Structure 1
Amino acid sequence: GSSGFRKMAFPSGKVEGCMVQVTCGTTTLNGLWLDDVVYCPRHVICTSEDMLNPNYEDLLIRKSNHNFLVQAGNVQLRVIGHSMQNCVLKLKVDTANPKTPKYKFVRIQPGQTFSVLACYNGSPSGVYQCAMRPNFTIKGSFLNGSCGSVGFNIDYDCVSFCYMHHMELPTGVHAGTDLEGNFYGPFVDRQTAQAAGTDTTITVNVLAWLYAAVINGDRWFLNRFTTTLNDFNLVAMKYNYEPLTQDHVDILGPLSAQTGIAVLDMCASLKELLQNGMNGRTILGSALLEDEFTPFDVVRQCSGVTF
């Protein structure tokens, strides 16, 4: 009686049509072409020596428009101006992208998810979902050449770009900026020592995923008990889970509504899973508790929202 539930990326076509390559000197990375501007990481202008201690304002003014080779597929775009907004370069080009989607630049919050279109040399290679971790990193898959790849959501009729890729930390997690060029987290676009802080599990998302399991007929873990927010948080603190807040209880409301299971009842089921384990069983195919689905991700998938 169960039904499937998968980590599902947004369809990527609207974003694929915006990916270009930007080459400055010997460095090539990806850019995002919206109307008559290409957005890309400003470190395209740096040599390996520059990256050790970059003076970005000085390095940018030393570049000419001709120093930027921008290619959309096999068509060379001509740069007519270059400016900087925080860590993002804006290259004004003399032609407008005819496939520009309705778009917004948004800054997401920790715990929220987005789709990544991983690209190399301006060409898309794959698509997958990520969550902004509480420590402001993402668990992605990015090789050399992926800088400038973007993360996005599709919100009704609009592509909301929220992430542009910049770096891989020594623990194999990833960091980047919003499309205004401001890093998520305390990271900087230079080759200086930086490390991911300690991470925690996104409790509200684990609860949303447990609701997804119930909605999809995989409900072996439900118990007959209920708890309070404070009592649940006493347990959350012992297992490196984020404290559950009232705002989180509120955003779980729609899933509580559809199942008839109150949030604090599901908290009691989660408490038993943390304290006693998974009993040699899976939930939606997983042997661990999944924390990279938001409540809205569950609603979107269970309702078949299209774009």
Structure 2
Amino acid sequence: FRKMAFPSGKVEGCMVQVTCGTTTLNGLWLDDVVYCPRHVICTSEDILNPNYEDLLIRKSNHNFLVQAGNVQLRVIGHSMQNCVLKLKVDTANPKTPKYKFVRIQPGQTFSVLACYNGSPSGVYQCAMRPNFTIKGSFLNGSCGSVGFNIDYDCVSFCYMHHMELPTGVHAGTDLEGNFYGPFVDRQTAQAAGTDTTITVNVLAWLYAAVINGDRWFLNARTTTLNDFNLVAMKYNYEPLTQDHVDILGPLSAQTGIAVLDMCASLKELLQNGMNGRTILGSALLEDEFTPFDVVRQCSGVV
């Protein structure tokens, strides 16, 4: 069972580069607006202690270089929404897909189209960690790369890359500019909080194993959600939500294994280990496949 990004063509046609001063990063061109991180307007020295409201007053439309490839798009208006700069341009992107801006939950996955200078470099699948970082693969100049999900040719944009933290994980915003987690767009000592394992995803992976005939771990017990949540937290596992129980519905229905029965199976694995057995060929419990990722991998979606 391997990770699988969404096809990225619909997002590739929306990638541009945004330059202000000497700073160049990536932007997302949808209809007649270009979205990018607001720290583009900072100098290498401003970023240490910025005042974004007053830095933006000093800027004009003619201070922003937006390019689709080498083709300039004239900026006809600018504004700041949270941590995102919105540059109105004079051309509506004819490649604009049907799209939505969504804010995702910790544990959810998305594809990231890594870009440099507005040029798509690669695509890979990421999970939002419970500490609101992603273990992405970004180099300098990757800021403004976006993460997304596709559902029947509507692109749901959920992530915009802003920075790398000291431990090498990445932080960013949704497309309305609101950071995921307690991070701010200033170059100061910031630390990701302690991470936990995404329980709903581990369960999805156990269902994937059952679907493929590996079911040695199914046991004979059950548990309540509240009791499972209290035990899981003792192993640094995330508690389950009512929404988590519901998105596990299809896999539970497909296998005939009740969600709370699978919780008791997981609890036994946490309490006693795997005893040198494997699951889907792993001795480690994998937590970066959502229930939709498992469904998607076994359905010929689009």
- Give the TM bin, normalised by the shorter chain: over 0.9
Query: What RMSD in Å do the two structures reach over aligned CA positions?
Result: 1.5
**CA deviation map 1:86-135 (0-9, x unaligned):** 11111111111110001111111122111111111111111111122221
Secondary structure, in 3 states, of the residue corresponding to 1:272? helix
Tell me, in whole angstroms, the C-alpha distance in 1 between the residues paired with 2:274 and 2:9: 39
Closer/same/farther in 2, CA of residues 78 and 285 from structure 1, 3 Å limit: farther
Q: Check if 1:192 corresponds to 2:182.
A: no
Change (3 A) 1:57 1:233: closer
Moved more, 117-126 or 282-291: 282-291
1:85 aligned partner: 81
Aligned with 2:228: secondary structure?
A: helix
Residue 260 of structure 1, aligned match among 256, 261, 265: 256
TM, length-normalised to structure 2: 0.95
- Structure 1 residue 238, shift from structure 2 partner: 2.3
- In the aligned structure 1, how far is the partner of 2:230 from the partner of 2:19? 53
Moved more, 183-192 or 58-67: 58-67
Distance 1:78 1:255 in 2: 49
What secondary structure sits across from 1:38 in the alignment? strand
How many residue pairs are counted as aligned between the two chains? 301
TM-fit CA distance, 1:284: 2.4
Instruction: State the Cα distance separating 1:30 from its structure 2 match.
Output: 0.3
Distance 1:74 1:285, change over 3 A: farther
Residues 1:233 and 1:85: Cα distance change in structure 2 (over 3 Å) = closer
- 1:55-75, Cα deviation, whole Å (9 max, x unpaired): 112211212222211111132
Q: State the 1:223 CA deviation.
A: 2.6
Distance 2:60 2:243 in 1: 49
Measured against aligned partners, the alpha-carbon deviations of 1:248-296 in whole angstroms (never above 9, x if no partner) come to: 2232111110001111221222122212223323322333111112212
2:4 aligned residue? 8
1:31 aligns with 2:27: yes
Percent identity (aligned): 99
Where 1:232 maps in the other structure, the secondary structure is: helix
Q: Which residue of 1 aligns with 2:55?
A: 59
What does the per-residue CA deviation read over 1:216-265, in whole Å, with 9 as the maximum and x for residues that have no partner? 22323223333333443343122111123444223211111000111122
**For residues 127 and 148 of structure 1, what CA distance do their matches in structure 2 show?**
14
Q: Deviations over 1:8-32 (max 9, x none)?
A: 1111110011001111111110000
Change over 3 Å in CA distance of 1:95–1:245 after alignment to 2: closer
Residues 95 and 246 of structure 1: CA distance in aligned 2, closer, same or farther (over 3 Å):
closer
TM-score by length of 1: 0.93
CA distance in 2, matches of 1:191, 1:109: 25
- Taking the aligned partners of 2:33 and 2:124, their CA distance within structure 1 comes to 26
Q: In structure 1, list runs of 5 or more residues that go unmatched.
A: none
Distance change >3 Å, CA 96–CA 230, structure 1 → 2: closer
Tell which deviates more after alignment, 11-20 or 226-235. Answer: 226-235
Rounded to whole Å, the distance in 1 between the matches of 2:124 and 2:260 is 31
Greater alpha carbon shift after TM alignment, 169-178 vs 129-138: 129-138
Change (3 A) 1:145 1:285: farther
Give the distance between the partners of 2:104 and 2:20, measured in 1 at CA.
30
Distance in 1 of aligned mates of 2:157 and 2:47: 26
| Cα offset, 1:143, TM superposition | 1.2
Q: What secondary structure is seen at the aligned counterpart in 2 of 1:303?
A: coil
